[PDB]
Amino acid sequence: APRSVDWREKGYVTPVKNQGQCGSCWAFSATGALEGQMFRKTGRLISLSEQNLVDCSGPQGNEGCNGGLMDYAFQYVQDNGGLDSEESYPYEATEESCKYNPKYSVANDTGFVDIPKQEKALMKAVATVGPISVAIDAGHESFLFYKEGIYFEPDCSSEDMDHGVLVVGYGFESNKYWLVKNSWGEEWGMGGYVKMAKDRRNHCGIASAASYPTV
C-alpha cells in the first residue's frame, strides 16, 4: 500500500461540517463515507443529509441526537431506497419528524463492509476504497482542546470508542498518522481535522469499528 494517501486531493471529501450540540456524529461519519463512495461511482461530489438520518433511521437502531452507529445509517439508506441531499433536507441539530422525500434522493447503498479490527486492514481499505467511517476514543479533555500535531493520548482506550469520524487518508511527518475529518466545525483542530497516531497499537481504537458502504 502507498506510503501516503489523502482522498481530499482527489475530490472525494466535502468541506468540514458541524454537528453542533447533538449526538449525531454517527450521521456525519456515515454521510462522509457515502459521499466518498458515491463520488467514486459517479464522479460527482454531493453533500448528503445528516438530518434525514437523524429523523428517519430509528427503525434501524439509531437514536437521533442521543446516539447511533454508522452501520445503522448505511442499513437505513438501503432499507429506505435512498437518502436526500443536504440542500433538500437541511441540518437542524435536533431530532424532528421524518421528512424523507424520494424526489430529492441523491445517494443509495446496497450494503456495507465491516473491516477486520487491525490497523493493517484499515490501511488497505483506506488505500483501495476511499474515506472510511471509524469510531475513536474522544473521551478526554485533550481531544476537546486539540489544535494541531499528531494526537496521542496516553490514557486512550481501544475498547470504549465514543465518537464517529472519517478517515480520509494517512501519512507521515518529518511520526505516522491517520488523517481524520471530524464534525465539530472548522474552528476545532486543523480546519476541523486531526492527525491521529498511526501504528501505535490501534491507538484510541481507530481500527476497531471501521466500515464503509457499498453503493
Ligand SMILES: N=C(N)NCCC[C@@H](NC(=O)[C@H](CCCCNC(=O)Cc1ccc(-c2ccccc2)cc1)NC(=O)Cc1ccc(-c2ccccc2)cc1)C(=O)N[C@@H](Cc1ccccc1)C(=O)NCCc1ccccc1
Ligand atoms: N460512549 C458511548 N457509547 N456514548 C455515546 C453517546 C452518543 C453519540 N455521540 C455523541 O453524543 C458525541 C460525543 C462524542 C465525544 C465526546 N467526548 C467526551 O465526552 C469526553 C470528554 C469528557 C470530559 C471533557 C472535559 C473538557 C473540559 C473540562 C472538563 C472535562 C471533554 C471531553 N456528541 C458530541 O460531540 C456532541 C455533544 C456533547 C455534549 C453536549 C451538551 C449540550 C447541552 C448541555 C451539556 C452537554 C452537546 C453535543 C454516539 O452515538 N456516539 C457513537 C460513536 C460510535 C460510532 C460507531 C461505532 C462505535 C462507537 C456511539 O457511542 N455509539 C454507541 C452507542 C449507541 C448505539 C445506538 C443508539 C444510541 C447510542
